[PDB]
Amino acid sequence: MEWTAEAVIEGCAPLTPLNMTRSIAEMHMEYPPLGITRFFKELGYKIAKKKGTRKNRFVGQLIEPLRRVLERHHLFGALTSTTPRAVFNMFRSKVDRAPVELHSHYPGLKKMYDILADLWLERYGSMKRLTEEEMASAINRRGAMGYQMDNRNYGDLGAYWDSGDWRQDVNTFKRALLSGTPTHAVYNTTAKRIIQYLPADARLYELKVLGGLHKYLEKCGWSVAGQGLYKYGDRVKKSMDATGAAISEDVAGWDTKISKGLLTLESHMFTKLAEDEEMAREIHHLYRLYADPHMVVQREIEGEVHDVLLRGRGQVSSGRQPTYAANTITNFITTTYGMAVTLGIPEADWPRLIRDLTDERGNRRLLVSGDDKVLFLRGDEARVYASSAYRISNDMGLVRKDMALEQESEIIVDVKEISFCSHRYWPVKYGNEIHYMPVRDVGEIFAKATMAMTQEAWARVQGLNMLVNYHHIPECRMLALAILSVTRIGLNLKGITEWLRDDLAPDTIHALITEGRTSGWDQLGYVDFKDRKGILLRPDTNYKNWRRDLPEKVRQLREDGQYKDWLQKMA
Ligand SMILES: [Mg+2]
């Protein structure tokens, strides 16, 4: 289907497509396009090789006795590689869908982007490019290199980073981008959902230029940027206490629905924040890339596997480091706008509104992380919001997941029923105080801890993370202590913070949750026995047998390293 016209947004620099001839030629397409997509425009294809699931040996073997109940009563879910046929079918089903570019809400959205940018600049100043030390802290060392870099034989981002060759490469990327004819600008893809990512040099560049957005979010009361999961429940509780009603709605396929119009506003805002005029040019040129995404996706026809070069318009790619910060900001702005219009908040009050949301003052609160949000309102405003705010997000194509288009919002009045960041939050006692701590299906928890000496270091970090965040769930505390008992001391955990250490102890956990008002293993709380069902493991004979055999399993899994016994910190 032909693309609609684009939105023309007053006061914003248009995101003109770059000259992509150089980056297209880098993909070495062989054949003219077949054209079987409805939105993406196929430019060509080439014959490929079928592209690709492995469980961590340490975590996997420790939970092996529970695999059956976790697969039968929970959401563990396992694993075969996705076929090219299945990859293209999922692309067509979920990604090959035109964003809604044309609607009447850009002028008011722009006003709020401008308000937020002005508040950040007034309070915190402009945004510098990341330093090398800052980039080293944020890179995923296991990330892929990308087809355009595969012939340099680095293996992964970590090895590429360590080599130091990226320093010249990112400046080569910068110069070509600013010229209007970029190199290495075509997205690679892999299935896990389709992940889209630029080559490693491009990714280090975009991290350097846009990585500072997280620093502003750390200052915002509506963001959880930089904060650990163990803090989120208390923030949900605090926000609810100030309001009394919550609306928690997910958008189906958020990344696929973001329009070039919204990207135009993102770029507008971020260029406002830049330290110097060259930085603003760099940001604007990156968004000229983002808004005109070219990507290679696999398919299979008559037994022949193709690498297909496709061109879209708008949308958001997942394997882009700024995506989290940009999604969070755009989610905050679109949600605040729809709420303010629906509740009739006058536009002259919008600067105060955005300040109060940022300062957690007043009778309206937001919590936002990427495409996930909870809106908190008094009951009276919640009813007004629930009755019609969906019309504005529908206008923008931000259709809500799993409900009818014009279904009124569900108004949540119990803090324990609010889903945020894929968890709910339950009250847990630490000594004589209560903190709200995260729960979700334990099959999901265990699966994420299993599906990736790097392997041992990775497992050990999963155990440290599980102990800090899920010690209130007994099976999670047990698995964590077992992980820490089977993984050796002295590994490089930082390559995989406050608690990321071999000598982790309760005092560190109490410092994070109660600021050290409590102490000891005995004041780390548990959920009530009566609630150990449903999303949590029922404590039946299967569970008690696993617990009985864990000490032996730990001893059998240990090898040549130095280990410490952690299971004695519990039953
Ligand atoms: Mg939510």
Residue numbers in the entry: 307 to 358, 362 to 387, 390 to 503, 519 to 778, 786 to 829, 837 to 911
Share the article's original sentences.
Jingmenviruses are a category of emerging segmented viruses that have garnered global attention in recent years, and are close relatives of the flaviviruses in the Flaviviridae family. One of their genome segments encodes NSP1 homologous to flavivirus NS5. NSP1 comprises both the methyltransferase (MTase) and RNA-dependent RNA polymerase (RdRP) modules playing essential roles in viral genome replication and capping.
Although the FL construct did not yield any crystals, the D55 and D307 constructs produced crystals with flake-like and stick-like shapes, respectively. Subsequently, the structures of native D55 and D307 were resolved through molecular replacement, utilizing the Se-Met-derived D55 structure as the search model. Due to the significant similarity between the native structures of D55 and D307, with a root-mean-square deviation (RMSD) value of merely 0.2 Å for all superimposable α-carbon atoms (with D307 structure as the reference, covering 99.5% of residues), we primarily utilize the 1.84-Å D307 structure for subsequent illustrations. The D307 structure exhibits unresolved regions, namely residues 359–361 and 388–389 in the index finger, residues 504–518 at the tip of the ring finger, residues 779–785 in the thumb loop located between α-helices 21 and 22, residues 830–836 in part of PE, and residues 912–915 at the very C-terminus. The active site is situated within the interstitial region of the three domains, encompassed by seven RdRP catalytic motifs A-G. Even if compared with the most resembling flavivirus RdRP structure obtained using an MTase-less DENV2 NS5 (39), the right-hand structure of JMTV NSP1 RdRP exhibits a tighter grip with the top of both thumb and fingers domains (primarily pinky finger) moving inward for 4–5 Å. The JMTV PE exhibits partial disorder, but it is characterized by a one-segment structure that closely resembles the PEs of flaviviruses in terms of length and structure. However, it is worth noting that the linker region in JMTV NE is approximately 10 residues longer compared to that of flaviviruses, and it forms a cofold with the palm domain. Remarkably, the quantity of intermediate products (specifically, 4-mer in the P2-to-P5 assay and 4-mer/5-mer in the P2-to-P7 assay) generated by NSP1 D307 was observed to be greater than that of FL NSP1 (when comparing lanes 13–21/22–30 and lanes 53–61/62–70).
